[PDB]
Design a protein around this nucleic acid. Structure first.
Lengths: 94, 116, 58, 71
RNA sequence: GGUUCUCCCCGAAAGCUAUUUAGGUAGCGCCUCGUGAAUUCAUCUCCGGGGGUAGAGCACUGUUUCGGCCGAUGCAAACUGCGAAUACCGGAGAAUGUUAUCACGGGAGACACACGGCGGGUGCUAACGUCCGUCGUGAAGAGGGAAACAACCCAGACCGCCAGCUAAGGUCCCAAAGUCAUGGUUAAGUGGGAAACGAUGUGGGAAGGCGUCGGCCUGCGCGGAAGA
RNA sequence: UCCUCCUAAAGAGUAACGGAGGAGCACGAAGGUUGGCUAAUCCUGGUCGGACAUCAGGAGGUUAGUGCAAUGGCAUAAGCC
RNA sequence: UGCCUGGCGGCCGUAGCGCGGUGGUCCCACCUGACCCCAUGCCGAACUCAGAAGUGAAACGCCGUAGCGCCGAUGGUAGUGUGGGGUCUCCCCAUGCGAGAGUAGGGAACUGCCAGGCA
């Protein structure tokens, strides 16, 4: 239902992760099924705004990158020990 | 726990012969049938195997499992080994007791002229 | 394969014995010295090891 | 309210240890002799013939074995 | 304590095992010259390695707590059902290194090292205190920068030229170079003295409140904050 | 004089009357070899025995032990008739 | 060449633990008695003598149960070699190597040789 915008990953590594965190972005992984996993990049502010609603854990997420519809569910999230910021999320396609 | 204990006790000679890496003659005893196998040091191939069940040697035997059958199996194993060229294989008792049919089979095999 | 130019930028006065051996293998004797070397995995590994003081004409 | 003993592996995998060389000297039995490897009274593993050394994992307990194979 | 002429090349250490020894005795480690010997040795790539260190976990040896020793939650130097980077041994490999590798002989030299960076012990997890494993400087390295200053940064001086470039550090003058720009902070000479408390000092940022009144975070100043 | 784990940064080694004790014995059998056997721990049944002076049906498989203070590996027991 | 059973090796939890069904054609299993080869630290407990006279009880081969248990990614996380910086007790920057656990996925294993019964 809701529209989500992300960017296709091009660089992989802890260096790329640190670059994204410095630039206010964070990586995410989507897997599930015989298809290979896809790594994407998402902005921190938009995901923080989205997480406010309690319907996030109950609604199936829709991702539109390069005009492709991907249906996923929030399998797991990573939270900093004390900083209220998001850094990574693992999703399973439904 | 009988078969497990038998396997464990036979494992002693099974591993002991491995270091010297010599062809081994093993015997499996059962009241119904008796089996004798020649196993190469690698342990994955058998040079020759005989069983009391086979008619070729059970025709002249009243019953498959007995002292006469063990002696016949020993003679057959000995002659096959002689015509194959085993070159004095070692032997293992497979955890059995060397007083009855096992001893009879060993004596029958040695009668042919083997030096094991 | 394609050859590349490797030039020294910083001295190895206070560098470790491994760094000194890497510089000796590269053949760079003085700061600013330039050499030509074929591109191979071993050369790439060495240049990554001592990348902080060597520039490459990729 | 002394002299430290020299432990550890002296020859590792791929070494062309010849006959009589001791592969490792450990306190107890960290590894068990396999093929062409002998064990001493003091729980020391030594080679019996020339060859290349290898370490393998086998058995229900997954016990480490030291073996020597023809080069 | 002294050891007197010049030039060329090479070029250490203040460490390791025993002492009715602690100032020394023997060898090993480090250096020089002569001879002999293998892609010998160093670097980097790939392959086979034991790791049990970091990280994690309570399955293994222990510990605090929770409902009334049973189960669980966290923790560990004489804890690992798991398990790094890194170091080290061997095999193969393009390339460089005046063989830089090893064997023998002659000659020695030294046998209270200091400081700093990296990870620890000790110490009251106060000390510019103490000892360790590794690397760098000095010892034996000139020169440039910080005010002098050796343990800080750059940089190994064959000689010479009234040549250019650059590393660290700087471009207001002393003293050679931007009184250069862009968007800001500071009102205190903070800069140019130092941590723990509080604050009607200020710019910015994410969230409150039925036009409205206030809370939290970040950068710079203030009383503690004192060197003859 | 000598051993036992750490500090000691996953080869060895690497400190300061460092943190810790033990041995300066013993078995001439506690040595070698062949056959077979191999738990500990806990519940349930016995005159008391309830687990704890002995026996058999189970939970569980190397938690008992291996002459020693301590230490590692040990069910192929490196134990025990 | 296909199904089933026993033995000899690799693999050593993708082979294990719990539950239901099936197996007497062959093979395997309970051994009755033993004064006879053999013997009990008492016991024919194990071993040795005769098989279908008695059956598949227990053990074991196979199917399912993914309930427990295991491995297992990409990704991230913690860490570290190298050069530098900071407010230097600790952290960050460019780069390389990269934790444990868990998620997707799997499996009730597979494979080489010999003997026997049914085809």
């Amino acid at each position: 239902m809701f529209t989500i915008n992300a960017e296709v990953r091009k660089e992989q590594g802890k260096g790329a992760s640190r670059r994204l965190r410095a630039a206010n972005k964070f990586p995410a992984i989507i897997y599930g099924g015989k298809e290979a996993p896809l790594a994407i990049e998402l902005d921190h502010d938009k995901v923080m705004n989205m997480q406010a609603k309690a319907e996030f854990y109950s609604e199936v997420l829709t991702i539109v990158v390069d005009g492709k519809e991907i249906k996923v569910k929030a399998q797991d999230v990573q939270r900093h020990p004390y900083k209220p910021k998001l850094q990574h999320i693992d999703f399973v396609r439904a | 726990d009988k078969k497990s204990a038998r396997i464990r006790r036979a494992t002693r000679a099974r591993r002991k012969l491995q270091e010297l890496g010599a062809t081994r003659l093993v015997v499996h005893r059962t009241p119904r049938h008796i089996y004798a196998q020649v196993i190469a040091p690698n342990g994955s191939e058998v040079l020759v195997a005989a069983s009391t069940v086979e008619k070729a040697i059970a025709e002249q035997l009243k019953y498959t499992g007995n002292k006469d059958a063990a002696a016949a199996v020993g003679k057959a194993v000995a002659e096959r080994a002689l015509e194959k060229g085993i070159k004095d294989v070692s032997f293992d008792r497979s955890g059995f007791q060397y007083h009855g049919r096992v001893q009879a089979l060993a004596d029958a095999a040695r009668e042919a002229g083997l030096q094991f | 394969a394609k050859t590349i130019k490797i030039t020294q930028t910083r001295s190895a006065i206070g560098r470790l014995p491994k760094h000194k051996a890497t510089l000796l293998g590269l053949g760079l004797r003085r700061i600013g010295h330039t050499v030509e070397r074929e591109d191979t995995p071993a050369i790439r590994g060495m240049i990554n090891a001592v990348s902080f003081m060597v520039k490459v004409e990729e | 309210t002394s002299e430290a003993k020299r432990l550890g592996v002296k020859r590792f995998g791929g070494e062309s240890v010849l006959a009589g060389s001791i592969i490792v000297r450990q306190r107890g039995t960290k590894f068990h002799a396999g093929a062409n490897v002998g064990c001493g009274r003091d729980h020391t593993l030594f080679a019996k013939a020339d060859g290349k050394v290898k370490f393998e994992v086998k058995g229900p307990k997954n016990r480490k074995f030291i073996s020597i194979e023809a080069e």
